[model samples]
Target: GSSGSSGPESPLQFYVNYPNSGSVSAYGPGLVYGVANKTATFTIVTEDAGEGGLDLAIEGPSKAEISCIDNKDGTCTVTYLPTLPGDYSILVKYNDKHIPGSPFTAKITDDSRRC
Candidate 1:
């Protein structure tokens, strides 16, 4: 993905498969090979941002918050440990700078991406 900053202070814009996809959150267990109702932890695999995506927000069952996580030398993974027998959801929130109070919203639809 290609990412760039439009203003002096703004979350850089990112486009898929272009360039500067920004930091990528990598985790273990391979994105979920099969659905399991258990507590699992994923380590941040790698992360790199000139003006990183630390501004990105996270939502899970506990509603935890973090910038970007780094498990590898240059990567990070958004980790979640599900303790229930149902599907979970993870939400990534952002600031568009054009909206007040709320700015942007990113939705994760894949069950593997949920907490």
Candidate 2:
């Protein structure tokens, strides 16, 4: 005599997803160090803060043009042009809160070329 064994056919699985908040990351050496009297641009990604608002403020010692544009892909592009040579204070905030290591300062040097 012989015995027959059988196993279950298939099984089910479940997946859980967690909710995330907001974040900002501003990169590029041009953002950290820029040339004065010239346009300097950088990008900031706010993937987590897609739903919320992503705000940025650029400040400097002298008159500087500050412009920021948000995109649908959770990215923001900021541009600045200064008349004087000075460091810039950048604030990358989301959801009414400042991001990690935000409010970064960018050094601006004179736009001069050595002969």
Candidate 3:
């Protein structure tokens, strides 16, 4: 499993990012790191709290905007494979209708999802 990859011998970290207008709340996965060939999906959802709603896309290493949702309350989910256990980064974007820091990143996992 992905969480299993993180241990005393080896450690893995995945980055999770929430935009300035949107916040990231994990429904599953935790801060713990690991490598999982079993295949797991990492997803991120963003909600527009401003006057103008926007559609956002989460750009990962392999997948680019793989998942999507509507404006005002848009959601994006991406699945990645950690064949080489270690730290990974997650990038997010709010398209063309947001302020600076519209894109951000952090370490997250399955414990990071709400669904």
Candidate 4:
């Protein structure tokens, strides 16, 4: 009477670094803010040992650049720069499967309003 789908599910975890004196910010999921032209670091951990070539896509203001760095471990770091003040969406995917929070919204502000 019910439809069930079962398969080997890959577990991937994502996290972000909050810039401050030197500590992780209390910012929650889908709630990341940064200043224009600044760099933001995003971290991801995959449980699949053989997982590689993971991909990330970011949709945001113009001039924004997104790049990823593999630590050679089970984790990878994604750095992004918002060249303009606007909202951006970050999506991390592994073989078509989206990480915990597929698309994350990043609220960007101008340097004048930056903290």
Full-model lDDT for every candidate? 0.38, 0.71, 0.40, 0.61
TM-score of 3: 0.34
Error of 4 at 21 (Å): 36
Q: Per-residue alpha-carbon lDDT of model 4 for 1-115, expressed as tens digits?
A: 8897795555585655443422112133323787777767756654443444567677766755666676766566666667788887766666565666557777777876436
Clashes of each: 9, 0, 18, 0
Candidate number with greatest lDDT = 2
Off by over 4 Å in 4: 1-31, 113-115
Ranking according to TM-score, highest score first: 2, 4, 1, 3
lDDT of 3 by residue, 9-61 (tens): 53576555555546444222411242333344544454544344434444334
Error of 1 at 37 (Å): 7.3
Highest TM-score: which candidate? 2
TM-score of candidate 2 on Cα atoms, chains taken together:
0.71
Task: List candidate 2 segments past 4 Å from native.
Answer: 1-17
Clashing pairs in 1: 1-19, 1-21, 2-19, 44-77, 46-74, 46-75, 46-76, 47-74, 47-75
lDDT, candidate 2, equals: 0.71
Runs off by more than 4 Å, candidate 1: 1-27, 33-37, 43-47, 53-72, 77-79, 93-115
For lDDT, candidate 1 versus 2, the one ahead is: 2
Error of 4 at 90 (Å): 1.2
